[PDB]
């Protein structure tokens, strides 16, 4: 009896490390190209840089999480460490979602038209504040380690609270708003952009289709697995939810690592700057 035995855990760890390395490299390259060059500090470039910073902050959590899923019995470096581990990750996820939504709205207003740096910066700050405030309850509802004198000490790692689980449930049910509304927004805006352009243009619509398909395939399983987790009632249900949630984790990390591949590396100016930096 062990969670995710070594039979299937080694490939999971390998793919997690690979995705972490790829995402870290991409985020570092994006941040460097945005900071070193002034012309690469436009509104869309600022959104992309903020999203890359958020993803990198999320990737800095793979280390710790890789440790939770390998050895969940030993300590997790205290409650405050875990609480912040869960809060920074959730806040960066919400910030990435809000930044994607804002970038889609900006692209729609720019292409489907019949902008100010101060306004864009204020909007980004407001989105970051909203993302950090929404993840507030994660600092109190969860993140607290929860359970011969030292044999007694073992078996402790973040688990949700037993009595406050209902609060976590009703919160995760409200978190669905961070999926349905951004999904609808991205879908409608990309459809309108394609209707205007496709009906250069072909490549743009293909990139938008690939981006939205990746967004769906990577985010819908996450919310599905979380809803299943908060709806676990039987032992077999928990056994299946374990696999579903690890697959959701893999898809989430794949999305966080491929975000710059779909957004930054596809741009002409970004590739030009990257070539001018390396040479």
């Amino acid at each position: 009896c062990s969670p995710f035995p070594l039979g299937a855990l080694v490939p999971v760890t390998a793919v997690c490390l690979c995705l972490f390395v790829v995402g870290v490299s991409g985020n570092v390259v994006t941040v460097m190209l945005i900071g070193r060059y002034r012309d690469m500090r436009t509104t869309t470039n600022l959104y992309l840089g903020s999203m890359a910073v958020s993803d990198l902050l999320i990737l800095l959590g793979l280390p710790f999480d890789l440790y939770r899923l390998w050895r969940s019995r030993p300590w997790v470096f205290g409650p405050l460490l875990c609480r912040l581990s869960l809060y920074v990750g959730e806040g960066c996820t919400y910030a990435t979602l809000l930044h994607m939504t804002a970038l889609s709205v900006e692209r729609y207003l720019a292409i489907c038209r019949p902008v100010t740096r101060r306004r864009v910066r204020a909007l980004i700050a407001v989105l970051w504040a909203v993302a950090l405030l929404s993840a507030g309850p994660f600092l109190f509802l969860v993140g607290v380690e929860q359970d011969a004198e030292a044999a007694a000490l073992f078996s402790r790692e973040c688990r949700p609270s037993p009595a406050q689980l209902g609060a976590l449930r009703v919160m995760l049910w409200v978190t669905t708003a961070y999926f349905f509304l951004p999904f609808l927004c991205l879908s409608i805006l990309y459809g309108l952009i394609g209707r205007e352009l496709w009906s250069g243009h072909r490549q743009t619509v293909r990139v938008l289709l690939v981006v939205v398909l990746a967004f769906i395939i990577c985010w819908l399983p996450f919310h599905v697995g979380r809803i299943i987790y908060i709806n676990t009632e039987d032992s077999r249900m928990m056994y299946f939810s374990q696999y579903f949630n690890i697959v959701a984790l893999q898809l989430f990390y794949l999305s966080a690592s491929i975000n710059p591949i779909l957004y930054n590396l596809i741009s002409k100016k970004y590739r030009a700057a990257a070539f001018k930096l390396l040479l």
Binding site: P3, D147, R159, S235, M238, N245, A248
Partner: peptide
């Protein structure tokens, strides 16, 4: 935060099924 069950919640759940 991706929900992942721990060793503690597996044994608790198993002990509940067997009463």
């Amino acid at each position: 935060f991706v929900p992942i069950f721990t060793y503690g919640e597996l044994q608790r759940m198993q002990e509940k099924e067997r009463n």
